Amino acid sequence: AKRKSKKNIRKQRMKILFNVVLEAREPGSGRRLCDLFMVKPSKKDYPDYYKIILEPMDLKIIEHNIRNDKYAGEEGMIEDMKLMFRNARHYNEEGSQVYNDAHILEKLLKEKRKELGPL
Ligand code: NI
Ligand code: NI
Ligand code: NI
């Protein structure tokens, strides 16, 4: 009874938080901030990326995890998002566009979670 309704609220919330990252655009240009986070770089094309980033993460993986109910709650999805953003900021230089995008997308995610409030 009360547990299927609670699983669905959690799953809904996870969709809302995912969609915030997916849809965010740069003011002025309309550039979609999430473009370079959608799929991890090709290992064949950029092997050095995988010597720096030991646990890769991208939105394709997180989308798969959401849809296949692999996360117990949004805190698990958020930890994957945070790993993705940390990877971006570890690999890319400070003041690069991808570095700044990771920062802004992480703030948007955190702000939308506070807006949703406690379960
Ligand atoms: Ni390093
Ligand atoms: Ni799978
Ligand atoms: Ni800032």
Backbone phi, then psi, for 64, in 5-degree steps? -60, -45
Q: Which ligand is nearest to the CA of 99?
A: 3
Gap between the Cα atoms of 7 and 87, Å rounded: 30
CA of 104 to the centre of ligand 3 (A): 6
CB-based contacts of 109, cutoff 8 Å, min separation 6: 17, 20, 21, 78, 81
Question: Is residue 53 within 8 Å of 114, Cβ to Cβ?
Answer: no
Q: Where are the domains positioned within the chain?
A: 1-119
* 4 phi/psi in degrees, rounded to 5: -70, -35
For residues 53 and 90, the answer to whether their CB atoms sit within 8 Å is: yes
- Rounded to whole angstroms, the Cα distance separating 84 from 111 reads 17
CATH number, span 1-119: 1.20.920.10
**Ligand 2 center to residue 96 CA distance, Å?**
32
Ligand nearest, relative to CA of residue 101: 3
CA of 69 to the centre of ligand 3 (A): 32
| Resolution in angstrom units | 2.1
Exposed / middle / buried, residue 28 (Cβ in 10 Å: 0-12, 13-18, 19+): exposed
Q: How far is the CA of 27 from the centre of ligand 2 (A)?
A: 35
